Symmetry: C2
Subunit: 418 residues, 2 copies
């Protein structure tokens, strides 16, 4: 219900109003406005021709760590009925109020019943089997090796690696059942969807414009197709663009068939400099169901390494999802460039952090969990297993792209805050 | 004041509530909720543990074109007093209600007075001299060739190219005065700041976390510095990462000194595939005051080309600002992947478009202006000069990065809308 001083200053500048003029237009005290840089908010919004939400400060300020005990986690249990049976139990892990919470599921569909599919969800997720039992994953109506596979639990001696993991692909329906008699739990961890802000906007476009967008995005989205959109944007043709960059038409065509060859790169960067765009977005990403990201217990075992005071093993990952991360951590300083979500699987562990009130700590037992904000310095003590998940748009890989395009990004951020 | 069905569905899924459960929790009719997919909004927000703004539909739906007559533009005139004199006149061009409007300025500070600097602004801008007179640009307290330069007007015969143009760099203070007796106007066109969403979030972090972020962003932001953050994020060291990718430690070091060599690229892409990140953000952007983007009348003349039915010439651009575009267009179909802002400089021109109610058109005289939404198909008729400006986060270059990382992006967008 508060006013963001950074958003307010933005809108005043956008309208080219001084503080005095703004207070005058809004009919409020100038000292009040200077301090801000409930009844004020509506007047300010109207004076600056914006919606109240456009001036609204975040509901959470100076968050560092949020935590949730095993007891609180167990208390959050909600049964899910599906296909005439008690199908899952659903529990939530630590997250800031209002944010999407990581989920633990009891898998209750028995081995002799095909698990009814959900509707899918936009956000991708890392799902890992916590065990103790093997489970079936289902990804299609018909039951084939492509749509039906066992997500194993670790039955052996290094249980800190709990089981198989994979990435649930965006939007595709899925479900789980027990592979046998033994019970099982999973963690499914969603990252923010990076295509969501585009879709939110595209949803409000006219149907005509939307159809035009889908045409431009249909088929193979290549260096050439994207470049042609960049050129049209700048009122250029391939002919005029190559001439502007001082590049032969044949060398441009060659670059577009091999963008990631350092000659292809040279041509595209030269064109980008001449025309005012970033060549990096023209470079190839890997061609795009569960087999690629699938990570076995063995895979994770093979990945084991020392990471400072910890031992670490990898869960599933995808190069097309750089913001979504998962690791097994054995405990016996941590700082990330975005958010972390942790859940204890073994031991009575202490999470320590430095926050606005100095050194702080919390003790967590299995099923206990925590969240850390971007760049919150922290560490774990005790002995010693926690699952480490990561998500967040800030700083996300798209932010990294922009930051490399920024002169003195630290100075820019400092200016924004004071 | 309406509810976005796409945001509502998102939050229900996030909480794992069915429609029936959601209506039940919110204490509203299930048919009402099914239709939505004022009194409902508050209850829904509370039930779904979100702020009302998080469910709010955009205030503008199905916008295609907005326009503003020369008369309406002239009527918007606002004087700006600075340093004891009438310093500018400020006019606004067509923009959707609430959005940042492009600005035209009368330059009124005389040649014998040094123009007092403003405070700067986060957003970069293309500024172009409309003439008829030359102007002084100022970019520093002391007057040096680096901080003081004439932005010329075209005095010759191809006036559709109106004058010199350049990019106002982010945050640096600037001002303008007349170079002589002749009066002058400029257009200054701002694009959205792509670092703004990061700063908005960073502003709400604890001071401790903020200081840690600035440390990680200080100095040279290189392939190696960014990679090391990516590795720490995944609980990897350079040693374990290279082993995971099956790459020799010496080949990784070599790649980080030459990321844009197709061997450097090969190593980084291999590491990105193995560890689950996008190598493209590790590749170099050009090293980063006014001299680089400065575009003379001659420059623009040299750039002239046929673009369909139009003749086009380039204004200033910057490779580190891919979303910000400007062109001179001579008139005697257009579709862009983001927003356009147009201002007529000569002739009585017709802008035609296809919108929700079929073919539409508007006639515009000099100073008349228009805005087009992303992918709105349009065309100009008549004879024949308009300035074409472009901005917008959607689809911006960061969206393009994500879209190349998406399986069947058109199918994803279609699903989001229905």
């Amino acid at each position: 219900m508060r006013i963001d001083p950074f958003k307010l200053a933005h809108w005043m500048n956008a309208r080219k109003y001084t503080a005095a003029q703004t207070a005058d237009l809004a009919g409020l005290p100038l000292d009040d406005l200077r301090r801000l840089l409930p009844a004020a908010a509506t007047a300010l919004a109207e004076a600056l021709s914006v919606e109240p939400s456009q001036l609204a400060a975040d509901a959470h300020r100076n968050l560092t760590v949020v935590h949730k005990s095993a007891e609180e986690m167990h208390a959050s249990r909600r049964p899910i009925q599906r296909d005439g049976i008690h199908f899952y139990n659903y529990y939530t892990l630590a997250a800031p109020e209002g944010r999407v919470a990581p989920v633990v599921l009891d898998i209750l569909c028995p081995s002799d019943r095909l698990p009814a599919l959900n509707n899918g969800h936009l956000e991708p997720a890392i799902t890992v089997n916590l065990g103790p039992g093997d489970i079936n994953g289902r990804w299609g109506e018909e039951i084939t090796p492509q749509t039906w596979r066992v997500l194993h639990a670790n039955h052996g001696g290094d249980r800190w690696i709990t089981g198989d993991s994979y990435v649930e692909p965006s939007y595709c329906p899925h479900s789980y059942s027990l592979a046998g008699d033994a019970p099982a739990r999973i963690v499914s961890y969603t990252a923010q969807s990076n295509i969501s802000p585009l879709m939110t906007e595209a949803n409000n476009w006219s149907t005509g414009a939307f159809e035009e967008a889908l045409k431009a995005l249909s088929g193979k989205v290549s260096a050439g197709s994207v470049l042609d959109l960049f050129l049209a944007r700048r009122a250029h043709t391939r002919t005029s663009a190559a001439e502007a960059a001082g590049v032969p038409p044949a060398d441009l065509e060659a670059a577009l068939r091999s963008p990631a060859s350092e000659t292809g790169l040279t041509v595209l960067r030269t064109l980008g400099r001449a025309l005012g765009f970033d060549y990096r977005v023209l470079l190839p990403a890997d061609d795009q169901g569960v087999g690629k990201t699938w990570t076995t217990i063995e895979d994770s075992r093979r990945s084991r390494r020392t990471f400072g005071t910890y031992e670490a093993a990898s869960m599933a990952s995808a190069a097309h999802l750089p913001d979504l991360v998962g690791s097994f951590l054995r405990v016996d300083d941590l700082i990330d460039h975005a958010e972390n979500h942790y859940v204890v699987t073994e031991g009575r562990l202490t999470l320590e952090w430095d926050g606005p009130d100095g050194p702080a700590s919390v003790e967590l037992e299995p099923d206990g969990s925590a969240w850390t904000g971007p760049f919150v310095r922290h560490r774990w003590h005790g002995t010693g297993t926690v699952l480490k998940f990561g998500s967040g748009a800030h700083l996300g890989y798209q932010d990294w792209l922009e930051l490399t395009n920024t002169f003195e990004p630290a100075a820019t951020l400092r200016r924004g805050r004071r």
